[PDB]
Amino acid sequence: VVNPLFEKRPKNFGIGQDIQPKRDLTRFVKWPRYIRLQRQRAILYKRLKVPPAINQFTQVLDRQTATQLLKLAHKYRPETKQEKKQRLLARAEKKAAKRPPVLRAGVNTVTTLVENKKAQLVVIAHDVDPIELVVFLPALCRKMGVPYCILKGKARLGRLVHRKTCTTVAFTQVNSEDKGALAKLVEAIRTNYNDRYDEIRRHWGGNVLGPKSVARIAKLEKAKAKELATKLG
Amino acid sequence: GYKYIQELWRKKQSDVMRFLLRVRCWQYRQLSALHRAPRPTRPDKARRLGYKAKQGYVIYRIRVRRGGRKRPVPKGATYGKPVHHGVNQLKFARSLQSVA
Amino acid sequence: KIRTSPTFRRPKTLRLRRQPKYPRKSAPRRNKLDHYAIIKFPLTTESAMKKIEDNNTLVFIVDVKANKHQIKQAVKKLYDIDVAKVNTLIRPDGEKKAYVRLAPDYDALDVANKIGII
Amino acid sequence: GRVIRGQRKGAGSVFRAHVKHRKGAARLRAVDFAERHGYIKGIVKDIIHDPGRGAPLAKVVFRDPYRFKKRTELFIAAEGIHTGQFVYCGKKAQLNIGNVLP
Amino acid sequence: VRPKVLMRLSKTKKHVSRAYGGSMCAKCVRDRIKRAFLIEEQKIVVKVLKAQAQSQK
RNA sequence: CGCCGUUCCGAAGGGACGGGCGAUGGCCUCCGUUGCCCUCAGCCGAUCGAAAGGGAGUCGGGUUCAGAUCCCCGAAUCCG
RNA sequence: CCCGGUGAGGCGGGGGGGCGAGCCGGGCUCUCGCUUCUGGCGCCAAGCGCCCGGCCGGCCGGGCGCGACCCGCUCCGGGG
Ligand SMILES: [Mg+2]
Ligand SMILES: [Mg+2]
Ligand SMILES: [Mg+2]
Ligand SMILES: [Mg+2]
């Protein structure tokens, strides 16, 4: 049933044999300056010995604790723009014939109430652009005995409030029913951040050579290890 | 609050601030000589110098070459009395910040 | 989507069209090169009377900014006479003399008789 | 004293080279995968006299291993080169005259 | 004729009716058809002498 | 003030055929239009630089006091 | 930080294939991975697998993978 016309014409992609195919070159592209800049700035955070104060933001909350955290931080979002008006209306018709506990946003307010010991839990975004804004909060929390935790994403911390990005978030008070969930989190957080603050304040990051240049050293070391592994007999 | 970032930006000889000032200086050294910044790098020093975070306020980052002001004259030859034979070690009367 | 070429070329984005909220100038400027401003006066010199008589043409001192097309279409409006061809030249005086040669059937001597020059 | 003739040569405008009738910079073929792991074969189209230069140049013509196109290159002609000769380039190229290899 | 006069002439006035007509001489045409068939032929001989070696060895 | 620099530290192409989607005008048949993706695209540097370089295509005869390969007659020719 | 090159085109490890030293079909050292008689041609996919889409398993017409190994943190090199 096969047709004797449909020949099979294989190409030889050897050197000088036939024109190389339209391969993939996403590795060898000449990128724009801004792309190459941020792509090789992410490498300096792997080559440079990063002090522990900045390195303490890589050890972040896991992927299972994060969900339950934002689950609890969804019952205490601030009010919208429309709910702000509709409260002025329900207050109007209240006048004609308590404030609920909610989240608390911003560094200038979280720090000022961590000093006042008003907070019960602090969430910090792990990728603040100028890190100086939250370099100190870890130590100020450990010092005051406030349970803090670093969360991955100032754009996901920023959906709790109705803004683009946020930096920190604080649970001052919670309702009765959710006080159990808050105490079931404060435990698993304080045992991960405040308890081991000694070993967090000492852990330098970065300082890791590129794989192309760690394989050139693992190979030479291998040759000198298999030397003693083969010359002894 | 800002008073933490303030006292932090005074230990420029520390470890964290000598790492940050160095990755910042490296990244700045790769961009153009005069380019607009998205947001104030130092938000505190900017408030202190009058930057309210509202529309209309713009932040430009700009780099200037350090060193004094060599006198713009032909090869050497500043024709005059020996008093004004100086070309090399001269200094400019406006700070590099005023030139930025 | 693999990168087939090692040159990142700028992607083409979308480009809108001017939808202004108010026209800059209020009114379109009227055409100051009217069919009347484009023809000042004729010539009555025996260098042009031999053109009218023999060559069946006319000689106008047209505006200097006028094409042979504007002239043709501006004698076919002021005088209603189909035109064979137009030959312009800028005089040393500065004005643009124009020799307009009328269609075969139309008689210059008898269309200059009308308008006055004869 | 006047700027000596030796000093007047670094500015140019008179002492610049006369690069009008020259045929191009005589350079080897750029290094690619072929030239780095095998060999690439080209022919010699002609041998021209470059002005202001004692050596002759040779238009060696390869074909791009990535596009459908015949690339020309201006080498300096080793002695014994003739036209229609085959010139190979790369690591696995054989060792005779006009055969650029590492 | 001059280059820009070629837009006037008809194709028969610009090419001879042959493979590579009016862009290559006939001698180098026949002397290229030859080399083409001959080189592909030797490529076939070598192709044969390849598996002829692989058969015994 | 500006100078340097002319492919050099650059996201440097606003284009094309075919296809798919959308709209439009009329023998709304069949082409044409423009909107959106898909596919494809090298270049090599904006621009200026020669009335002697390159550069398609007009010749005869007549005529004016002064203009003619330019006007008149008669024969062609290039480009779109 | 500097230099050279290029339309930043196959870099570094790992796997897969073939040849020889070897131990007795199985693990290692190796290396290669397809172009040298000629002044020829060489792209814009053959092929196998997988799916979908209209008209009557059958005409027509699309898409995906292999072909064209996977994974990576600097485009490759040379300085430092
Ligand atoms: Mg002074
Ligand atoms: Mg010009
Ligand atoms: Mg000219
Ligand atoms: Mg000329």
Coordinates of C-alpha atoms in Angstrom, one line a residue, chain E:
Chain E
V1 CA 23.8 48.0 -24.6
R2 CA 24.0 50.2 -21.5
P3 CA 22.6 48.7 -18.3
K4 CA 19.4 50.7 -18.1
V5 CA 18.6 50.0 -21.8
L6 CA 17.9 46.4 -20.8
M7 CA 14.4 47.3 -19.6
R8 CA 13.5 47.9 -23.3
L9 CA 14.7 44.7 -24.8
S10 CA 12.8 41.4 -24.8
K11 CA 14.0 38.4 -22.9
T12 CA 15.2 36.7 -26.1
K13 CA 17.4 39.7 -26.8
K14 CA 19.1 39.2 -23.3
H15 CA 19.5 35.4 -22.9
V16 CA 20.3 32.5 -25.1
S17 CA 17.9 29.6 -24.7
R18 CA 20.0 27.1 -22.7
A19 CA 20.6 26.1 -19.1
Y20 CA 22.5 28.9 -17.5
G21 CA 21.6 31.0 -20.6
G22 CA 23.3 34.3 -20.9
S23 CA 24.9 34.1 -17.5
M24 CA 27.5 31.4 -18.2
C25 CA 29.4 30.3 -21.2
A26 CA 28.6 27.0 -23.0
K27 CA 32.1 25.6 -22.5
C28 CA 31.9 26.0 -18.7
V29 CA 28.3 24.6 -18.8
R30 CA 29.3 21.3 -20.4
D31 CA 32.5 21.4 -18.3
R32 CA 30.3 21.8 -15.2
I33 CA 27.6 19.2 -16.0
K34 CA 30.5 16.8 -16.5
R35 CA 32.1 17.6 -13.1
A36 CA 28.7 17.4 -11.4
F37 CA 27.9 14.0 -12.6
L38 CA 31.4 12.7 -12.2
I39 CA 31.8 13.9 -8.6
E40 CA 28.4 12.5 -7.5
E41 CA 29.6 9.3 -9.2
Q42 CA 32.8 9.1 -7.2
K43 CA 30.7 9.8 -4.1
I44 CA 28.7 6.7 -5.0
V45 CA 31.9 4.6 -5.6
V46 CA 33.2 5.7 -2.1
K47 CA 29.8 5.0 -0.6
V48 CA 30.0 1.5 -2.0
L49 CA 33.6 0.9 -0.9
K50 CA 32.6 2.0 2.6
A51 CA 30.1 -0.8 3.4
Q52 CA 32.2 -3.1 1.2
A53 CA 34.9 -2.6 3.9
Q54 CA 32.3 -2.9 6.7
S55 CA 31.1 -6.2 5.3
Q56 CA 34.3 -8.1 5.8
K57 CA 35.4 -6.0 8.8

